[PDB]
Structure 1
Amino acid sequence: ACTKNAIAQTGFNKDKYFNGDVWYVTDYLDLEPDDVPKRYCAALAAGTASGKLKEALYHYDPKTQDTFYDVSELQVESLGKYTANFKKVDKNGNVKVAVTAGNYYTFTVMYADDSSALIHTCLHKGNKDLGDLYAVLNRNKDAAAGDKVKSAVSAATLEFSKFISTKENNCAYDNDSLKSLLTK
């Protein structure tokens, strides 16, 4: 279960974040580990498409090769805090698993600048028990976390040294698909 009420960035600039570009997850912190994907790859595109706030997600397990894309319409709770009902799709946007009540994630932008961000997400999917997940994002897939985002990690009362890096996984992304999915 999730336990954090993440605080959104003071002065969060929604148009800059939701500009249609891609964000790569460089480091993550899951508060309920299991025995994971200690090795994982993820990226997202965020933007407004035909007046609707959307996000397109990509997940890839670099060891098992398990891959999936999602598209979500985001609903606003408050500045920088959203609720997203996702639909699993192929890379071209064809639906594989339709939107279902009960299958959603919350998303909070705790910090963001033009190149980096810190987010919190709480996933709800059917029957699985899931916990809070924090992610450090960058516009450059290979960027080491800079002082602005690491300071935000500290301000959230988290230890950046506990975050797991995604950089040693040889991850390659289909950026074109992520961007096109925003319209689906």
Structure 2
Amino acid sequence: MDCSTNISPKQGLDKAKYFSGKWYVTHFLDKDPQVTDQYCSSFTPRESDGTVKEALYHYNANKKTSFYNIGEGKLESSGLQYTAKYKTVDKKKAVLKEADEKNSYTLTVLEADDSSALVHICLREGSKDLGDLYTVLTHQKDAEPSAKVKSAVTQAGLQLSQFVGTKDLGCQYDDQFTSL
């Protein structure tokens, strides 16, 4: 597998709209999943002098288990795009593994407004691309994405209908973990 190539951040986006609130994934598009388990995710991204830190949460909807990470990276010269190394933590944010130099993700923001966003994420380990994911995001669980963000899905060459909708998965979030 190869992460999608035509990916660059939309220019003219207002970063205070992305580094805002918390995000819940309402729809995801996973190109070549190595597992069949489907997940829910929420994260809280903050930025300061070009360094991003974000608490990251995954819920396995089949096994009904959750795992936790903290990402850190630097904004690119191109705009709202950053490559993040990440720690592995427990629900109390105790560090189980420090960030290393082989594991990272690149996050690119394709659209972001007052209520919603579209972002792309390539997860990598050493020389291999592990996962390519598009995610539609809202600020509350199960809120409808904006017409603008829906338009950006189609602009990106995609069909929203072909994403997995997370509402039917029976998601469970930990809003204490994502807070702050």
Q: Distance in 2 between matches of 1:150 and 1:53?
A: 26
Aligned length: 178
Q: Which amino acid aligns with 2:144?
A: A
Shift of 1:76: 1.4
The one-character-per-residue Cα deviations of 1:8-53 (angstroms, maximum 9, x if unpaired) are: 122111122113x21000000011134522x321111011369842
Shift of 1:93: 1.5
Shift of 1:144: 2.9
Structure 1 window deviating more from structure 2 (153-162 vs 8-17): it is 8-17
Give unpaired runs (5+ residues) of structure 1.
none
The one-character-per-residue Cα deviations of 1:80-110 (angstroms, maximum 9, x if unpaired) are: 1100001111122111121111111000000
> Does structure 1 conserve the Cα–Cα contact (< 8 Å) formed by 2:9 and 2:80?
yes
Which residue of structure 1 lines up, in the alignment, with residue 43 of structure 2? 44
Provide the TM-score with structure 2 as the length reference.
0.89
Give unpaired runs (5+ residues) of structure 2.
none
Which residue of structure 2 lines up, in the alignment, with residue 115 of structure 1? 115
1:96 aligns to 2:96 (yes or no):
yes
Q: Distance in 1 between matches of 2:35 and 2:99?
A: 29
Shift of 1:165: 0.6
Q: Which amino acid aligns with 1:64?
A: K
1:138 aligns to 2:138 (yes or no):
yes
Question: Partner of 1:130: helix, strand, or coil?
Answer: strand
Cα root mean square deviation, aligned: 2.1
Identity of paired residues, percent? 45
Q: Distance in 1 between matches of 2:146 and 2:75?
A: 29
Q: Which amino acid aligns with 1:54?
A: K
Structure number with the higher strand fraction is 2
Which residue of structure 1 lines up, in the alignment, with residue 15 of structure 2? 14
Q: Which amino acid aligns with 1:9?
A: K
The one-character-per-residue Cα deviations of 1:104-141 (angstroms, maximum 9, x if unpaired) are: 10000000001100000000136875231100000121
